[PDB]
């Protein structure tokens, strides 16, 4: 399938090189996936998403997203328009506050939720989580990740927004979990994107296009907007059957545009998340 004119963003994950406009994937496009966006929540009535995002649970008031930064993160993980993974289906966990502020003892909560929950959905292709959020280092916090990790969920989790070694944040410093950097759209790292040994992959940050609240759509940048590219295309690749949730992150690294990215610091992976998809 080809989407013309797409956001520069998904054209970047299909090609093998920068300046396209047009995203190429496979039709399947995650059908039979699940992705958890773990975030203010999601504005599940855009019209972007097509019936397939529902709010799942929420530690506040209401599940709805006051903010728009999970509905943001959502639309790139999954929007007809701006997604990744077209036919994925999408379940909202609202952790943050319409201020985008959370308790890391409510995160921790959100994270174990959706270990158990998934056995309440149907996901044959497999289950993925992106956690476009973090604070100060925390061994409870990378833990809790570590778990959802291991009960057979893709964990993705942004890098942070420091211009900082990743290694002080969490759950960016987790092992285990796939921490993902941000770039921009002529394959330098992105002036924010945090770097350092515990990043995996890096994907696009800068200036992304995605749904927004009240149902609009907006450019921001951040390793929160990256996270999801990485999230969608592993819900994507498990869907073609080339990896699993245990695997998804490494085949990701493996796969990767390598060695095109500037701005990389010594002793960081220099690796550009890419679909390799052949139309
Ligand atoms: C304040 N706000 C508004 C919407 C969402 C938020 C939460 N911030 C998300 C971006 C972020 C801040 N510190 C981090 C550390 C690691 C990874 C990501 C981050």
């Known amino acids: 399938a080809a989407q013309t004119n797409a956001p520069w963003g998904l054209a970047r994950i299909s090609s093998t090189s920068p300046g396209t406009s047009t995203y190429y994937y496979d039709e399947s496009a995650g059908q039979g996936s699940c992705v958890y966006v773990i ?63 959370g308790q890391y003892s409510t995160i921790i909560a959100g994270m174990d939720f959706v270990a158990s929950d998934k056995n309440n959905r149907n996901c044959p292709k497999g289950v993925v989580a992106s956690l476009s959020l973090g604070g100060g280092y925390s061994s409870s916090v990378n833990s809790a990740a570590a778990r959802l990790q291991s009960s057979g969920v893709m964990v993705a989790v942004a890098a942070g927004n420091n211009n900082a070694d990743a290694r002080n944040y969490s759950p960016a410093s ?22 350092g040994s515990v990043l995996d992959i890096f994907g696009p940050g800068t200036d992304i296009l995605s749904t ?28 073609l059957g080339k990896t699993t949730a245990a695997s998804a992150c490494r085949y990701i690294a493996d796969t990767a545009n390598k060695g095109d990215l500037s701005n990389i610091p010594f002793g960081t992976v220099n690796l550009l998340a890419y679909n390799n998809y052949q139309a």
């Open 39 to 101: 975030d203010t929540g999601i504005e599940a009535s855009h019209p972007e998403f097509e019936g397939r995002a529902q709010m799942v649970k929420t530690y506040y008031y209401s599940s709805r997203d006051g903010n728009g930064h999970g509905t943001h993160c959502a639309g790139t993980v999954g929007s007809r328009t701006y997604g990744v993974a077209k036919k994925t289906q999408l379940f909202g966990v609202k952790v943050l506050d319409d201020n985008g502020s």
């Open 212 to 239: 927004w609240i009240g149902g609009s759509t907006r450019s921001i940048s951040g390793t929160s907007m990256a996270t999801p590219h990485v999230a969608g295309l592993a819900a994507y690749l498990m869907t």
């Open 174 to 195: 987790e092992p285990s979990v796939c921490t993902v950097g941000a770039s921009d759209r002529y394959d330098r790292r992105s002036s924010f994107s945090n770097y």
